[PDB]
Coordinates of C-alpha atoms and ligand atoms in Angstrom, one line a residue:
Chain A
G4 CA -44.0 284.3 -59.8
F5 CA -47.5 283.5 -58.6
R6 CA -51.0 283.8 -60.4
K7 CA -54.4 282.0 -60.4
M8 CA -53.6 279.1 -62.8
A9 CA -56.5 276.9 -64.2
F10 CA -56.0 273.3 -65.5
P11 CA -55.4 273.1 -69.2
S12 CA -59.1 272.7 -70.5
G13 CA -58.6 270.5 -73.6
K14 CA -59.7 267.2 -72.1
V15 CA -63.0 269.0 -71.1
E16 CA -63.4 271.0 -74.4
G17 CA -63.6 267.6 -76.3
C18 CA -66.8 266.6 -74.1
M19 CA -68.7 270.0 -74.6
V20 CA -72.0 269.8 -76.6
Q21 CA -75.1 271.9 -77.1
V22 CA -78.6 270.7 -75.6
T23 CA -81.8 272.4 -77.0
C24 CA -85.4 271.7 -75.9
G25 CA -87.9 274.2 -77.4
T26 CA -86.4 277.6 -77.2
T27 CA -84.1 276.7 -74.2
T28 CA -80.4 275.9 -75.4
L29 CA -77.6 275.2 -72.9
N30 CA -74.4 273.2 -72.6
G31 CA -74.0 269.4 -71.9
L32 CA -71.2 267.1 -70.9
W33 CA -70.7 264.2 -73.4
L34 CA -68.9 261.1 -71.8
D35 CA -69.0 257.8 -73.6
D36 CA -72.7 257.5 -74.8
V37 CA -74.3 259.8 -72.3
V38 CA -74.9 263.7 -72.4
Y39 CA -75.1 265.3 -68.8
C40 CA -77.1 268.7 -68.5
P41 CA -79.2 270.9 -66.2
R42 CA -82.6 269.5 -66.1
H43 CA -84.0 272.9 -66.3
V44 CA -83.4 272.7 -70.3
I45 CA -87.0 271.2 -70.1
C46 CA -88.6 274.4 -68.9
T47 CA -90.3 277.3 -70.6
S48 CA -90.4 280.9 -69.0
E49 CA -93.8 280.0 -67.5
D50 CA -92.4 276.6 -66.1
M51 CA -89.3 278.0 -64.4
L52 CA -90.9 280.2 -61.7
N53 CA -92.4 276.8 -59.9
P54 CA -91.3 273.7 -61.8
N55 CA -92.7 270.2 -61.2
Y56 CA -89.8 268.5 -63.0
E57 CA -91.0 264.8 -62.8
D58 CA -94.3 266.1 -64.3
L59 CA -92.5 268.1 -67.1
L60 CA -90.1 265.1 -67.9
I61 CA -92.7 262.6 -68.4
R62 CA -94.3 265.0 -71.2
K63 CA -91.1 264.8 -73.1
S64 CA -89.7 262.2 -75.6
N65 CA -86.2 261.7 -77.0
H66 CA -87.0 263.7 -80.1
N67 CA -87.8 267.0 -78.1
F68 CA -83.9 266.9 -77.3
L69 CA -81.7 268.4 -80.0
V70 CA -77.9 267.4 -79.1
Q71 CA -75.4 269.1 -81.3
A72 CA -71.5 268.3 -81.2
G73 CA -69.9 270.9 -83.3
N74 CA -72.4 270.8 -86.2
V75 CA -73.3 267.0 -86.0
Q76 CA -76.6 266.1 -84.4
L77 CA -76.4 263.2 -82.1
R78 CA -79.6 261.1 -81.7
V79 CA -80.9 260.7 -78.2
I80 CA -82.1 257.1 -77.6
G81 CA -82.9 257.4 -73.8
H82 CA -83.4 260.1 -71.1
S83 CA -83.6 259.8 -67.3
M84 CA -83.1 262.3 -64.4
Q85 CA -80.8 262.1 -61.5
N86 CA -81.4 265.0 -59.1
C87 CA -81.1 268.3 -60.9
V88 CA -79.2 266.6 -63.9
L89 CA -80.6 265.1 -67.0
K90 CA -78.9 262.2 -68.8
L91 CA -79.4 261.8 -72.4
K92 CA -78.3 258.4 -73.9
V93 CA -77.0 259.1 -77.4
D94 CA -76.3 256.4 -80.1
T95 CA -72.7 257.7 -80.5
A96 CA -69.7 257.3 -78.3
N97 CA -67.5 260.4 -77.6
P98 CA -63.8 259.1 -78.6
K99 CA -62.6 262.2 -76.9
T100 CA -64.0 261.1 -73.6
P101 CA -60.9 261.3 -71.0
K102 CA -60.5 259.0 -67.9
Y103 CA -62.8 260.7 -65.6
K104 CA -64.7 260.6 -62.1
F105 CA -67.6 262.5 -60.5
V106 CA -66.6 263.9 -57.2
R107 CA -68.3 266.1 -54.7
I108 CA -65.8 268.8 -53.6
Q109 CA -65.5 270.3 -50.0
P110 CA -65.9 273.9 -49.2
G111 CA -62.5 275.7 -49.4
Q112 CA -61.4 273.2 -52.5
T113 CA -60.5 274.9 -55.8
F114 CA -61.4 273.8 -59.5
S115 CA -61.1 275.2 -62.9
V116 CA -64.3 276.3 -64.9
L117 CA -64.7 275.8 -68.5
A118 CA -67.2 278.6 -69.2
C119 CA -69.1 277.5 -72.4
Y120 CA -71.9 279.2 -74.5
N121 CA -74.0 277.0 -77.1
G122 CA -71.7 274.1 -76.5
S123 CA -68.5 276.1 -77.4
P124 CA -65.9 276.6 -74.9
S125 CA -65.3 280.5 -74.1
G126 CA -62.9 280.7 -71.2
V127 CA -61.3 278.9 -68.2
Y128 CA -60.5 280.3 -64.9
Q129 CA -59.9 278.9 -61.2
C130 CA -62.8 279.1 -58.6
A131 CA -63.1 277.8 -55.1
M132 CA -66.1 276.2 -53.5
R133 CA -66.9 279.2 -50.9
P134 CA -67.9 278.1 -47.1
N135 CA -71.6 279.1 -48.0
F136 CA -71.4 276.8 -51.1
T137 CA -71.6 279.5 -53.7
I138 CA -68.9 280.2 -56.2
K139 CA -67.7 283.5 -57.4
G140 CA -67.6 282.8 -61.1
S141 CA -68.0 284.6 -64.3
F142 CA -71.0 283.4 -66.0
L143 CA -73.7 284.9 -68.5
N144 CA -76.9 283.9 -69.9
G145 CA -76.2 280.4 -71.9
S146 CA -73.4 279.3 -69.5
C147 CA -75.7 276.7 -67.8
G148 CA -74.1 273.2 -68.1
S149 CA -70.6 274.7 -68.0
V150 CA -68.7 272.3 -65.7
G151 CA -65.9 272.6 -63.0
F152 CA -63.0 270.1 -62.8
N153 CA -59.7 269.1 -61.5
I154 CA -57.0 267.0 -63.5
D155 CA -55.0 264.5 -61.7
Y156 CA -52.4 262.7 -64.1
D157 CA -54.5 262.0 -67.2
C158 CA -57.7 261.8 -65.0
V159 CA -60.6 264.5 -65.1
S160 CA -62.5 264.9 -61.6
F161 CA -65.9 266.7 -62.5
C162 CA -67.0 268.6 -59.6
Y163 CA -69.5 271.3 -60.7
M164 CA -72.2 271.9 -63.2
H165 CA -73.5 275.7 -63.5
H166 CA -77.1 276.3 -62.9
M167 CA -77.8 279.8 -61.4
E168 CA -76.7 283.2 -60.7
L169 CA -78.0 284.6 -57.3
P170 CA -79.0 288.3 -57.1
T171 CA -75.7 289.1 -55.2
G172 CA -74.0 288.2 -58.5
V173 CA -72.4 284.8 -57.0
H174 CA -73.2 281.6 -58.5
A175 CA -74.7 278.2 -57.4
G176 CA -74.7 274.8 -59.0
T177 CA -74.5 271.0 -58.6
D178 CA -72.0 268.0 -58.5
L179 CA -72.5 265.6 -61.5
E180 CA -74.9 263.4 -59.7
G181 CA -77.3 266.6 -59.7
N182 CA -77.0 267.7 -56.0
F183 CA -76.7 271.2 -55.3
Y184 CA -74.0 272.8 -53.4
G185 CA -75.7 274.8 -50.7
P186 CA -79.4 275.4 -49.9
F187 CA -80.3 276.3 -53.4
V188 CA -83.1 275.2 -55.8
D189 CA -83.5 275.3 -59.4
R190 CA -86.5 277.6 -59.5
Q191 CA -86.5 281.1 -60.8
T192 CA -86.7 282.9 -57.3
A193 CA -84.2 285.3 -55.9
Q194 CA -82.3 283.1 -53.2
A195 CA -79.8 284.2 -50.7
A196 CA -77.0 282.4 -49.4
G197 CA -75.6 281.9 -45.9
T198 CA -73.2 284.6 -44.4
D199 CA -69.9 283.9 -46.2
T200 CA -66.7 283.1 -44.2
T201 CA -63.0 283.3 -45.4
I202 CA -61.2 280.2 -46.1
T203 CA -58.4 280.4 -43.4
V204 CA -56.2 277.4 -44.6
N205 CA -56.0 279.1 -48.1
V206 CA -55.1 282.5 -46.9
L207 CA -52.2 280.9 -44.9
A208 CA -51.2 279.2 -48.1
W209 CA -51.3 282.5 -50.0
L210 CA -49.1 284.3 -47.2
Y211 CA -46.6 281.4 -47.7
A212 CA -46.5 282.0 -51.6
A213 CA -46.0 285.6 -50.9
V214 CA -42.9 284.8 -48.6
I215 CA -41.8 282.5 -51.4
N216 CA -42.0 285.4 -53.9
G217 CA -40.2 287.8 -51.5
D218 CA -43.1 289.6 -50.1
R219 CA -42.3 289.5 -46.4
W220 CA -43.3 292.9 -44.7
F221 CA -46.4 291.3 -42.8
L222 CA -44.2 288.7 -40.9
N223 CA -43.4 289.1 -37.2
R224 CA -41.2 287.4 -34.5
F225 CA -44.4 286.1 -32.6
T226 CA -46.3 282.7 -32.2
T227 CA -50.0 281.9 -31.1
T228 CA -51.6 278.7 -29.9
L229 CA -54.0 277.0 -32.5
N230 CA -56.8 277.9 -30.0
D231 CA -55.9 281.5 -29.6
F232 CA -55.5 282.0 -33.2
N233 CA -59.2 280.2 -33.8
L234 CA -60.8 282.7 -31.5
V235 CA -59.5 285.7 -33.4
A236 CA -60.1 284.0 -36.7
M237 CA -63.9 283.2 -35.7
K238 CA -64.2 286.9 -34.6
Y239 CA -63.3 287.9 -38.2
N240 CA -65.5 285.4 -40.0
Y241 CA -62.6 283.4 -40.8
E242 CA -63.2 279.5 -40.8
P243 CA -61.5 277.3 -38.1
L244 CA -58.0 276.0 -38.7
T245 CA -57.9 272.3 -37.9
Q246 CA -54.8 270.2 -37.0
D247 CA -55.5 268.7 -40.4
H248 CA -55.0 272.1 -42.0
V249 CA -51.8 272.6 -39.9
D250 CA -50.6 269.2 -41.5
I251 CA -51.5 270.2 -45.0
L252 CA -49.6 273.3 -44.6
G253 CA -46.3 271.4 -43.5
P254 CA -44.4 271.4 -46.9
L255 CA -45.0 275.1 -47.2
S256 CA -43.8 275.4 -43.5
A257 CA -40.7 273.3 -44.3
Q258 CA -39.9 275.1 -47.5
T259 CA -39.9 278.7 -46.1
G260 CA -38.8 277.7 -42.5
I261 CA -41.8 279.5 -41.0
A262 CA -43.7 277.3 -38.6
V263 CA -47.6 277.2 -39.2
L264 CA -48.4 278.8 -36.0
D265 CA -45.7 281.6 -36.6
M266 CA -47.7 282.5 -39.9
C267 CA -50.8 282.3 -37.8
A268 CA -49.7 285.0 -35.5
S269 CA -48.8 287.2 -38.8
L270 CA -52.3 286.7 -40.0
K271 CA -53.8 287.5 -36.6
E272 CA -52.0 291.0 -36.9
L273 CA -53.2 291.4 -40.3
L274 CA -56.8 291.0 -39.3
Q275 CA -56.4 293.2 -36.3
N276 CA -54.4 296.1 -37.7
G277 CA -55.1 295.8 -41.6
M278 CA -52.7 296.1 -44.4
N279 CA -52.2 299.9 -44.0
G280 CA -52.6 300.5 -47.8
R281 CA -49.8 298.2 -48.4
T282 CA -50.2 295.0 -50.9
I283 CA -49.3 291.3 -50.8
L284 CA -48.6 289.9 -54.3
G285 CA -50.4 292.8 -55.8
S286 CA -53.5 292.4 -53.7
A287 CA -55.1 295.0 -51.4
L288 CA -57.1 292.1 -49.8
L289 CA -56.1 288.7 -48.2
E290 CA -56.7 286.0 -50.9
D291 CA -58.5 282.9 -49.9
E292 CA -58.8 281.0 -53.5
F293 CA -55.4 279.0 -53.3
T294 CA -55.3 275.8 -51.6
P295 CA -51.8 274.6 -50.1
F296 CA -51.7 272.1 -53.1
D297 CA -52.3 275.1 -55.6
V298 CA -49.3 277.0 -54.0
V299 CA -47.1 273.9 -53.9
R300 CA -48.0 272.9 -57.6
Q301 CA -47.3 276.5 -58.9
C302 CA -44.1 277.0 -56.7
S303 CA -42.2 273.8 -56.9
Chain B
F5 CA -64.4 290.5 -63.1
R6 CA -62.0 287.6 -63.3
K7 CA -58.8 287.2 -65.3
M8 CA -59.9 284.5 -67.9
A9 CA -57.8 282.5 -70.2
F10 CA -58.7 281.1 -73.4
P11 CA -59.7 277.6 -73.6
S12 CA -56.2 275.9 -74.2
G13 CA -57.1 272.8 -76.0
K14 CA -55.9 274.0 -79.6
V15 CA -52.6 274.7 -78.1
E16 CA -52.3 271.7 -75.9
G17 CA -52.4 269.5 -79.3
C18 CA -49.3 271.3 -80.6
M19 CA -47.1 271.1 -77.4
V20 CA -43.9 268.7 -77.9
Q21 CA -40.7 268.3 -76.1
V22 CA -37.1 269.1 -77.8
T23 CA -33.9 267.7 -76.3
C24 CA -30.4 268.3 -77.1
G25 CA -28.5 265.9 -74.7
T26 CA -30.0 266.2 -71.4
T27 CA -31.4 269.8 -72.2
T28 CA -35.2 269.5 -72.6
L29 CA -37.6 272.3 -73.5
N30 CA -41.0 272.8 -74.8
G31 CA -41.7 273.1 -78.6
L32 CA -44.7 274.1 -80.8
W33 CA -45.6 271.7 -83.4
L34 CA -47.5 273.3 -86.3
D35 CA -47.8 271.4 -89.6
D36 CA -44.4 269.9 -90.2
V37 CA -42.3 272.4 -88.3
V38 CA -41.6 272.4 -84.7
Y39 CA -40.6 276.0 -83.0
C40 CA -38.4 276.2 -80.0
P41 CA -35.9 278.4 -78.1
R42 CA -32.5 278.3 -79.9
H43 CA -30.7 277.9 -76.5
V44 CA -31.8 274.2 -76.5
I45 CA -28.3 273.9 -78.4
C46 CA -26.3 275.6 -75.6
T47 CA -24.1 273.8 -72.9
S48 CA -23.9 275.3 -69.3
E49 CA -20.2 276.2 -69.7
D50 CA -21.1 278.4 -72.8
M51 CA -24.2 280.4 -72.0
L52 CA -22.5 283.8 -71.1
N53 CA -22.1 284.6 -74.7
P54 CA -22.9 281.7 -76.9
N55 CA -22.0 281.9 -80.6
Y56 CA -25.3 280.5 -81.9
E57 CA -24.2 280.4 -85.6
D58 CA -21.1 278.3 -84.4
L59 CA -23.0 276.2 -82.1
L60 CA -25.7 275.3 -84.9
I61 CA -23.0 274.5 -87.6
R62 CA -21.7 271.7 -85.4
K63 CA -25.5 270.4 -85.0
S64 CA -27.2 267.9 -87.4
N65 CA -30.8 266.7 -87.9
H66 CA -29.9 263.7 -85.9
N67 CA -28.7 265.6 -82.6
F68 CA -32.2 266.7 -82.1
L69 CA -34.8 264.6 -80.2
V70 CA -38.3 265.9 -80.9
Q71 CA -41.2 263.9 -79.0
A72 CA -45.0 264.1 -78.8
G73 CA -45.3 262.3 -75.4
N74 CA -42.8 259.4 -75.7
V75 CA -43.4 259.3 -79.6
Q76 CA -40.2 260.5 -81.6
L77 CA -40.8 263.0 -84.6
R78 CA -37.7 262.4 -87.0
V79 CA -36.1 265.7 -87.6
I80 CA -35.4 266.3 -91.4
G81 CA -34.3 269.8 -91.4
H82 CA -33.0 272.8 -89.0
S83 CA -32.6 276.4 -89.2
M84 CA -32.4 279.4 -87.0
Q85 CA -34.7 282.6 -87.2
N86 CA -33.7 285.1 -84.7
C87 CA -33.9 283.5 -81.4
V88 CA -36.0 280.6 -82.3
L89 CA -34.9 277.2 -83.9
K90 CA -37.1 275.6 -86.5
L91 CA -37.0 271.8 -87.0
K92 CA -38.7 270.5 -89.9
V93 CA -40.2 267.0 -89.0
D94 CA -41.5 264.3 -91.3
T95 CA -45.1 264.3 -89.8
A96 CA -47.6 267.1 -90.1
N97 CA -49.4 267.6 -87.0
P98 CA -53.0 266.5 -87.2
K99 CA -54.2 268.6 -84.6
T100 CA -52.6 271.8 -86.1
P101 CA -55.3 274.7 -85.8
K102 CA -55.8 277.6 -88.0
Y103 CA -53.2 279.9 -86.7
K104 CA -51.2 283.1 -87.1
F105 CA -48.0 284.6 -85.7
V106 CA -48.4 288.0 -84.3
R107 CA -46.3 290.5 -82.4
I108 CA -48.2 292.2 -79.7
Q109 CA -47.9 295.6 -78.2
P110 CA -47.5 296.6 -74.4
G111 CA -50.9 296.5 -72.9
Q112 CA -52.0 293.5 -74.7
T113 CA -53.1 290.4 -72.9
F114 CA -52.6 286.8 -73.9
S115 CA -53.1 283.3 -72.4
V116 CA -50.0 281.3 -71.4
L117 CA -50.1 277.5 -71.4
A118 CA -47.2 276.6 -69.0
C119 CA -45.7 273.3 -70.0
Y120 CA -42.9 271.1 -68.5
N121 CA -41.3 268.4 -70.8
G122 CA -44.1 269.0 -73.4
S123 CA -46.7 268.4 -71.0
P124 CA -49.1 271.3 -70.2
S125 CA -49.6 272.0 -66.5
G126 CA -51.7 275.1 -66.3
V127 CA -53.2 278.2 -68.2
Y128 CA -53.3 281.8 -67.0
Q129 CA -53.9 285.2 -68.3
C130 CA -51.4 288.1 -68.5
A131 CA -50.5 291.3 -69.8
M132 CA -47.3 292.5 -71.6
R133 CA -45.9 295.2 -69.5
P134 CA -44.6 298.6 -71.0
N135 CA -41.1 297.5 -70.1
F136 CA -41.7 294.3 -72.2
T137 CA -41.8 291.7 -69.4
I138 CA -44.7 289.5 -68.1
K139 CA -45.6 288.8 -64.6
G140 CA -45.9 284.9 -65.5
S141 CA -45.5 281.8 -63.2
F142 CA -42.7 279.9 -64.9
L143 CA -40.4 277.3 -63.2
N144 CA -37.3 275.7 -64.7
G145 CA -38.5 273.7 -67.7
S146 CA -41.1 276.0 -68.8
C147 CA -38.9 277.5 -71.8
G148 CA -40.8 277.2 -75.0
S149 CA -44.2 277.5 -73.4
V150 CA -46.2 279.8 -75.6
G151 CA -48.8 282.7 -75.2
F152 CA -51.8 283.1 -77.5
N153 CA -55.1 284.7 -78.3
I154 CA -58.0 282.9 -79.9
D155 CA -60.4 284.8 -82.5
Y156 CA -62.9 282.5 -84.1
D157 CA -60.9 279.3 -83.9
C158 CA -57.8 280.9 -85.2
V159 CA -54.9 280.9 -82.7
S160 CA -52.7 283.9 -82.8
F161 CA -49.4 282.9 -81.0
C162 CA -47.7 285.9 -79.7
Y163 CA -45.2 284.8 -77.1
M164 CA -42.6 282.1 -76.5
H165 CA -41.0 281.9 -73.1
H166 CA -37.2 282.2 -72.8
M167 CA -35.8 283.8 -69.4
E168 CA -36.6 284.9 -65.8
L169 CA -35.1 288.3 -65.0
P170 CA -33.6 289.2 -61.3
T171 CA -37.0 290.7 -60.1
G172 CA -38.8 287.5 -60.9
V173 CA -40.4 288.8 -64.1
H174 CA -40.2 287.0 -67.5
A175 CA -39.1 287.7 -70.7
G176 CA -39.3 286.1 -74.3
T177 CA -39.8 286.2 -78.1
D178 CA -42.6 286.3 -80.6
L179 CA -42.8 283.1 -82.9
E180 CA -40.4 284.8 -85.3
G181 CA -37.8 284.9 -82.6
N182 CA -37.7 288.6 -82.0
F183 CA -37.3 289.3 -78.2
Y184 CA -39.8 291.7 -76.7
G185 CA -37.8 294.5 -75.2
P186 CA -34.0 295.0 -75.0
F187 CA -33.4 291.3 -73.8
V188 CA -30.9 288.9 -75.2
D189 CA -30.7 285.1 -74.8
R190 CA -27.4 284.9 -72.8
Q191 CA -27.2 284.3 -69.0
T192 CA -25.8 287.7 -68.4
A193 CA -26.8 291.0 -66.5
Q194 CA -30.0 292.2 -67.8
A195 CA -32.5 294.3 -65.9
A196 CA -36.1 295.4 -67.0
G197 CA -36.2 299.2 -67.0
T198 CA -38.9 300.7 -64.8
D199 CA -42.4 299.8 -65.7
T200 CA -45.3 302.2 -66.2
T201 CA -49.3 301.7 -65.6
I202 CA -51.0 300.6 -68.8
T203 CA -53.3 303.7 -69.3
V204 CA -55.6 302.1 -72.1
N205 CA -56.5 299.2 -69.9
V206 CA -57.1 301.4 -66.9
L207 CA -59.6 303.3 -69.1
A208 CA -61.1 300.1 -70.3
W209 CA -61.6 299.1 -66.6
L210 CA -63.3 302.4 -65.9
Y211 CA -65.7 301.7 -68.9
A212 CA -66.4 298.2 -67.3
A213 CA -67.1 300.0 -64.0
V214 CA -69.6 302.4 -65.8
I215 CA -71.4 299.5 -67.6
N216 CA -72.0 298.0 -64.0
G217 CA -73.4 301.1 -62.7
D218 CA -70.4 302.3 -60.8
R219 CA -70.0 305.7 -62.1
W220 CA -69.2 308.3 -59.4
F221 CA -65.9 309.2 -61.0
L222 CA -67.3 310.7 -64.1
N223 CA -66.8 314.5 -64.3
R224 CA -68.2 317.6 -66.3
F225 CA -64.6 318.1 -67.9
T226 CA -62.9 316.8 -71.1
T227 CA -59.1 317.2 -72.1
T228 CA -56.9 316.9 -75.2
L229 CA -55.1 313.8 -75.9
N230 CA -51.7 315.8 -75.7
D231 CA -52.7 317.5 -72.3
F232 CA -53.6 314.0 -71.0
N233 CA -50.4 312.4 -72.3
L234 CA -48.3 314.9 -70.5
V235 CA -50.1 314.6 -67.1
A236 CA -50.2 310.8 -67.2
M237 CA -46.4 310.6 -67.6
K238 CA -46.1 312.6 -64.4
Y239 CA -47.9 309.8 -62.7
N240 CA -45.9 306.8 -64.1
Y241 CA -48.8 306.2 -66.7
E242 CA -48.2 305.1 -70.2
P243 CA -49.2 307.9 -73.0
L244 CA -52.0 307.0 -75.1
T245 CA -51.6 306.2 -78.9
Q246 CA -54.2 306.8 -81.6
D247 CA -54.5 302.7 -81.6
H248 CA -55.4 303.2 -77.9
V249 CA -58.1 305.7 -78.8
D250 CA -59.4 303.5 -81.5
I251 CA -59.8 300.3 -79.3
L252 CA -61.8 302.2 -76.8
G253 CA -64.4 303.0 -79.5
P254 CA -66.9 300.4 -78.8
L255 CA -66.9 300.8 -75.1
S256 CA -67.2 304.7 -75.6
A257 CA -70.2 304.0 -78.0
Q258 CA -71.8 301.4 -75.5
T259 CA -71.6 303.9 -72.5
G260 CA -71.9 307.2 -74.3
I261 CA -68.9 308.4 -72.5
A262 CA -66.2 310.1 -75.0
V263 CA -62.7 308.6 -74.6
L264 CA -61.4 312.3 -73.9
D265 CA -64.1 312.6 -71.2
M266 CA -63.1 309.4 -69.5
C267 CA -59.4 310.6 -69.9
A268 CA -60.4 313.8 -68.0
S269 CA -62.0 311.4 -65.3
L270 CA -59.0 309.4 -65.0
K271 CA -56.9 312.5 -64.7
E272 CA -59.0 313.6 -61.6
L273 CA -58.6 310.1 -60.0
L274 CA -54.6 310.5 -60.4
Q275 CA -54.5 314.2 -59.2
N276 CA -57.0 313.4 -56.2
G277 CA -57.0 309.8 -55.4
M278 CA -60.0 307.9 -54.8
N279 CA -60.5 309.0 -51.2
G280 CA -61.5 305.8 -49.6
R281 CA -64.2 305.1 -52.3
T282 CA -63.8 302.1 -54.5
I283 CA -64.3 301.2 -58.3
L284 CA -65.7 297.7 -58.9
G285 CA -65.0 296.9 -55.1
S286 CA -61.1 297.6 -55.6
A287 CA -59.4 300.6 -54.0
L288 CA -56.8 299.8 -56.8
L289 CA -57.1 300.9 -60.5
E290 CA -56.7 297.5 -62.6
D291 CA -54.3 297.7 -65.7
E292 CA -54.3 294.1 -67.1
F293 CA -57.8 294.1 -68.6
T294 CA -57.8 295.3 -72.4
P295 CA -60.9 296.7 -74.1
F296 CA -61.5 293.3 -75.7
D297 CA -61.2 291.5 -72.3
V298 CA -63.8 293.8 -71.0
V299 CA -66.2 293.3 -74.0
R300 CA -65.3 289.5 -74.1
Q301 CA -66.2 289.1 -70.5
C302 CA -69.5 291.3 -70.6
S303 CA -70.5 289.4 -74.0
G304 CA -70.9 285.8 -75.1
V305 CA -67.7 285.3 -77.2
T306 CA -66.8 281.8 -78.1
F307 CA -64.1 280.1 -80.1
Ligands
NA1 NA1 -54.9 307.1 -57.7

């Protein structure tokens, strides 16, 4: 079988806390003796329209920040800002701190989101960083400071902190150094993303998952050149496929015996003819939020 | 809308491995008991019609290797309850959450924590089908992985994984070892019976669409529950129970759309199709979101 699968969330749940400043409460990430959270926790409703964050932060002291782990208050003994993230030094180390790294992910890469409200984990689901640097998440009021991550052995790579919901209902946020993905800004203004494009390497990985799970109606005897495929892909607002991508699809190509450029010819026909009201792995649409690695991990 | 799993940490802290010989599968460690599939005691040559009572007689506490990672928990008692083995161990799990064992109905959803050799790999949501199978993602080594729901820090365990059917769907038991469906734990010929669409979940999804302003499918008509159920069965939809009508109450109150008026709306969609038009940007009616899942996702619920 083959489903969207998230990483087990326990190593991240043990790091979630609530951060309050005035009547603004959101989530923070507690690693060793530091709590990371969105810097807009320091804003009022009047502030959030056009915030001068360096000005707003200098008017704050440690005691303006209430950090709660379960129902235990941690004392803030220092604060700094790094881009759009606030770093609250607390007088207590988190013993549940996992091995971790901060990473900045690339468009097309996937991660798990632990959606949290008032410092309490609510749900876990798998996202991709879209080519326009938005994520198609599920986040409500209070979700800010929720994080996205990957787990490799025992090591959590944090790649996303949640900040914003655009008017189209997609989501924007930062890496854990506080830099936005995409052209977004942490002000209360309606922001549009760039045109979005489909993650071609991922669609191919999902078609290979489909073959592996016995869904083959879309295959054909034909091949294409990489350049000819890319011309059609670009026509349909799909990202270019690189030789690096062809290489990354190698294991799935080997497993199924279907050469990457033969699978490219199948996708070209799907784009040109459509699916004719047929489905692939239950989907009426071509799915582009599984990476090659996600398909191998799940299909071993 | 997304399939969202429950946070898995409270279950991660209960997963162990159970080995007989070179057969390793997952177990659930709650207080001083480990629960696992009873076929951990089988040999390959004897899985066509194993005599579990006579395979278990020949086993003693010292034939079971229970490990939390590489740490052995000594077995001090064993018993079989239906298709589950219960191994009493000499250590109470300090990570035991508040829990219950529940037997779910078809249509109910739950999170699966897929594990291999006691080590959690991934978490996903899924629905018990009306034919008592789940469309899981399970590889060899996943047996003993569990399914659960969380309500206010209480973990309700509802599924333990046992077997893959010929069509690639999965079957298992509750935590009392009773199979969902007509399945048996022997490597024999078993096929799941034809599946149907989970009507109560389609109606929850239509309510979700109305909550989000997508309401072109609402009509001037109503139906009786009996007339609806007879029509639904002609389209391979499950009939509604009184419990289904009751669990749609909150969404009916929120939208102001009576359950039997939504039924009359769905009946028109079944008779006429959607005609190009989508609902929540899907041409397909979704049947794996429960009324709870629609509320859970539209509201702030934490655990
Ligand atoms: Na229909």
